[PDB]
Amino acid sequence: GSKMAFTLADRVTEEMLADKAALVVEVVEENYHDAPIVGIAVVNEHGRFFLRPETALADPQFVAWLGDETKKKSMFDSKRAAVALKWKGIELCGVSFDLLLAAYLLDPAQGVDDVAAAAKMKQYEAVRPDEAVYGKGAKRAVPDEPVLAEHLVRKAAAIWELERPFLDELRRNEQDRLLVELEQPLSSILAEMEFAGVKVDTKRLEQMGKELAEQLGTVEQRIYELAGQEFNINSPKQLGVILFEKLQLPVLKKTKTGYSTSADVLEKLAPYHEIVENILHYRQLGKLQSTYIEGLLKVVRPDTKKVHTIFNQALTQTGRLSSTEPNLQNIPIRLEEGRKIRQAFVPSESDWLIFAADYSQIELRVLAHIAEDDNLMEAFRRDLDIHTKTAMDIFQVSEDEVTPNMRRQAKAVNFGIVYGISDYGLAQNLNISRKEAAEFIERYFESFPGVKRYMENIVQEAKQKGYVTTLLHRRRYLPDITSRNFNVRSFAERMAMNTPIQGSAADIIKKAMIDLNARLKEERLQAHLLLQVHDELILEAPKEEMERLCRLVPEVMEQAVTLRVPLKVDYHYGSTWYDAK
DNA sequence: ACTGGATCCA
DNA sequence: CTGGATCCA
Ligand SMILES: Cn1cnc2c(O)nc(N)nc21
Ligand SMILES: [Ca+2]
Secondary structure (H helix, E strand, O other): OOOOOOOOOOOOHHHHHHOOOEEEOOOOOOOOOOOOEEEEEEEEEEEEEEOOHHOOOOHHHHHHHHHHOOOOEEEEEEEHHHHHOOOOOOOOEEEEEEEHHHHHHHHHHHHOOOOOHHOOOOOOOOOOHHHHHHOOOOOOOOOHHHHHHHHHHHHHHHHHHHHHHHHHHHHHHOOOOHHHHHHHHHHHHHHHHHHHHHEEEEEEEEEHHHHHHHHHHHHHHHHHHHHHHOOOOOHHHHHHHHHHHOOOOOOOEEEOOOOOOOOOHHHHHHOOOOOHHHHHHHHHHHHEEEEEEEHHHHOEEOOOOOOEEEOOOOOOOOOEEEEEOOOOOOOOOOOOOHHHHHHEEOOOOOOOEEEEEEEOOOHHHHHHOOOOOHHHHHHHHOOOOOHHHHHHHHOOOOOOOOOHHHHHHHHHHHHHHHHHHHHHHHHHHOOOOOOHHHHHHHHHHOOOHHHHHHHHHHHHHHHHEEEEEEEOOOEEEEHHHHHOOOOHHHHHHHHHHHHHHHHHHHHHHHHHHHHHHHHHOOOOEEEEEEEEOOOOOEEEHHHHHHHHHHHHHHHHHHHOOOOOOOOEEEEEEOOOHHHOO
């Protein structure tokens, strides 16, 4: 179509080093760790400039400019640029605006993943989607210099022009401090985390993988004996044919293409045939083997024996982070065979230890705070076992009349309450009927009328405003809250109930990370953040710092915000992640 | 099936 | 160009 004017520079000049600029330090590899910087673009009051990285990054004044906190840069996905630079021994500072995080706050549902998607939100279309320039995947190539250079300049141009309107809307939404004081500082901390990585004991993992391949070989053969034939145990067609046609097992549930084989269903079928328990066992081992063992071993960098996740800070609808390549927010814990995987996550230096602090029932505590339910707030003020308390109220029994099955039902009710309670959902979860679920629910609201009030109020608020909000003013638009379709409307209503809870808990732990990173430097500790797992933080530190951390970390996490109820943090440390329990 | 995720599989 | 199964908070 048209061409944007810019200087294709081949040396750094002084006018490129103004104290405010849009900056693009482009990394095209999806995974940016130790990845190439393919080009650089600067747009400031003086003009528009493209620089080849091998020039710019070898230039002393440019590098000094990058690291000077007083020279302000506007960017998109500054964490990607900061991390690729960290791997090159270069420090990036003074990022005062990140367009990706600004777009995220304004509307998490837009799924902005390039400068073009963010630009579209304010009707600016003078820039191409990255996919148009680079291609899909495995055809994805860096193009030739004139194509590349104009593209980076156009993105930088967009960033320069869109700061004002993004900030104005953030300000109108009261989300400007959310971006400036929370999401942007947190982005620097995440960059440090990702870069630091987590040391992995690959021999431990290789040996677990060996035992797994052993057991898996045994179970697989047994399965073939019992089926009287070989088949692909991971094929849905083939396993369905064996269970339900050759062995004539009852069909308790269908998927929309065939028979359900979820573990749920399989447990009911166990009484009928010895094959079932074995398939369950195979699925358990096979998940461990192919996802955790083989998966982790594939992404460990052999140069450092570390894994360097990426924490996606602009993806979830609620404001949580997610983690990819590897996902280190889903390492097994609940069953012991899987938990053993955590034995392979080790401190990065000798005589250091892993330290883990987790919030105790933050969501339920946030809910008490938001709903101001007198009885919920008393329960946490009396630091009660919340599930046992809910069993007492719903079943009207005394503490020592609470049976294990009673506590289990009340636990499930507590989960449903935070998720957005559903008589069907609870009934499915508990394997009971909707009418019996409805009465648990009804008993819950009699015991906790402030919470019922909150669930009613928040749905009406979502309806009238068009969105819900968290404690630190994160927003989520719920246009389906008025659908005439029952399923669709009900789902929005759950999102209305859950999002201030889940999202406020995200707000809190994010603030806690920022506060903690400041306190650790103030305290001159060598301890640092490795991971966040929604309501927990994992650090590593010299053994000599364990005692100060036992007091410091819970204190900081507990005081991140002050609610109508206290927050409670437990901590553990040990020589592996497995032992910090 | 009552929230939010990621990855392996076919 | 996915949707089922299963691991996490
Ligand atoms: C075998 N195989 C590879 N990719 C696939 C996909 O997307 N769907 C299905 N059904 N099979 C696939
Ligand atoms: Ca497909």
